[PDB]
Amino acid sequence: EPQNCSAT
Amino acid sequence: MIPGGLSEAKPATPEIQEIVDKVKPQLEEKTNETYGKLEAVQYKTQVVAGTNYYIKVRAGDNKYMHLKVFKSLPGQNEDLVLTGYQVDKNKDDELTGF
Amino acid sequence: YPPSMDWRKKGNFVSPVKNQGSCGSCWTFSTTGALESAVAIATGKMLSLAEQQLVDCAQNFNNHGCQGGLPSQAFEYIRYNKGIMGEDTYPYKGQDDHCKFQPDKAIAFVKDVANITMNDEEAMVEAVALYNPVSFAFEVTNDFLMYRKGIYSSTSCHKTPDKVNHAVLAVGYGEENGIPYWIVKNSWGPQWGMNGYFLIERGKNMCGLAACASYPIPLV
Ligand SMILES: *[C@@H]1O[C@H](CO)[C@@H](O[C@@H]2O[C@H](CO)[C@@H](O[C@@H]3O[C@H](CO)[C@@H](O)[C@H](O)[C@@H]3O)[C@H](O)[C@H]2NC(C)=O)[C@H](O)[C@H]1NC(C)=O
């Protein structure tokens, strides 16, 4: 899974 | 709420206001205008090597401006700096990076 | 893993402290930091990678130049883009410019990217201890600004991925009198804190140290 934090 | 981005919009505070009053002479040394009262309406913060305030200032019946001030880091001796300013803004125009 | 770790001590594996100014490029400074260290650790070449590259081009990996970004994504940029140049060839300017990437000039490569699970602090502890300095983000409250020395603890921040706001480089870990900490490289010039460095309390996922951290595997 892509790092959710620096997303939106 | 990414790293290095801008915080959510928050209402203006007495410190923010102060920032706009300390800074108002600069907006003027550049625009060569003479604004009346500039009222801190809302704001956003951004973490750089210091802070970058993005202030939505209400100044004129229903005339809003978007000032951008960079507050230094406690370290060295330096004041607030008007590093940018958008004019002709609305009451709702979202504050943004610039 | 050892009670302590510190790549600076181990060698010419950590670059000088960099200053990032009034641009929201702090993420690019984590990225360049990690990679530099990786390369050095893996080869002995201490290189100073260009952050403007990331400021001007990472756009596709969900970053936004001076108004933010994440290192994992930055790492992907470096991978897919096929390299990243260093300072002397793509000077740091702090503002949003349009990409000036030049392929025959890239000096550092990213083969794969190690993503440390969300909120998994010990995995950071492992990585930093066993492989590289880890790039990371956390909530920075005003307290943090004053920082000068010691171990920065906070009851002000909240360890949630809804407000972390500053990427940094974990270059080690250690212990002080009984409280555990992180040896961290910042991107605000050497004058701030302990010569560019700061020490946050370890073990509590303080401010979200472990929220969205990573390290990169260099193509070397
Ligand atoms: C580690 O975290 C990073 C950060 O979120 C994740 O990055 C994503 O990595 C994928 C590969 O798994 C990238 O896919 C590539 O996208 C480019 C963009 O068009 C394209 O050339 C290819 O289609 C390719 O699929 C993706 O760009 C990237 N996403 C972000 C938001 O940066 C990564 O998934 C995580 N790694 C692991 C092993 O979990």
In degrees, rounded to 5, the angle at the alpha carbon of residue C143 between the alpha carbons of residues C139 and C147 is 100
C-alpha dihedral (C91, C92, C94, C95), degrees to nearest 10: 30
Backbone angles phi, psi at C41, to 5 degrees: -55, -40
CA C130 to chain centre: 17
- Cβ atoms of residues B39 and B21 within 8 Å: no
Tell me how far apart the alpha carbons of residues B45 and B39 are, in angstroms, rounded to a whole number.
Answer: 17
- Cβ-nearest to C68 among B4, B70, B74: B4
In degrees, rounded to 5, the angle at the alpha carbon of residue C71 between the alpha carbons of residues C188 and C6 is 65
Catalytic residue among C26, C57, C66, C212: C26
C190 exposed, middle or buried (CB, 10 Å; 0-12, 13-18, 19+)?
Answer: middle
Tell me how far apart the alpha carbons of residues B67 and B65 are, in angstroms, rounded to a whole number.
Answer: 6
B1-98 CATH, one of 1.10.3720.10, 3.10.450.10, 3.40.50.1820, 3.50.50.60: 3.10.450.10
C32 touches chain B (CB under 8 A): no
C115 touches chain A (CB under 8 A): yes
- Cβ atoms of residues B71 and B86 within 8 Å: no
Least Cα distance to C68 among B33, B9, B1 occurs for B1
Pocket of ligand 1 (CB under 6 A): A 1-3; C 60-62, 72-73, 76, 80, 113, 115
CATH of domain C1-220: 3.90.70.10
- Cβ atoms of residues C51 and C25 within 8 Å: yes
Q: Which residue has the tokens 């958008």?
A: B86
C166 is catalytic: yes
CA C175 to chain centre: 21
Could you state, in order of their start, the residue ranges of all structural domains in chain B? 1-98
B31 touches chain C (CB under 8 A): no
- What the block records as the tokens of C171 is 């270059």
Alpha-carbon radius of gyration of chain A: 5
Helix crossing, C71-80 with C26-43: angle to 10°?
60
Could you state, in order of their start, the residue ranges of all structural domains in chain C? 1-220
Least Cα distance to C168 among C191, C185, C144 occurs for C185
Which protein residue has the closest C-alpha to ligand 1 atom 16?
C61
C-alpha dihedral (C146, C150, C155, C159), degrees to nearest 10: 100
**Interface residues of chain A, partner chain B, Cβ below 8 Å:** 5-8
- B97: DSSP letter: -
Instruction: Tell me the structure's resolution in angstroms, rounded to a single decimal.
Output: 2.8
B3 with A7: Cβ contact below 8 A: no
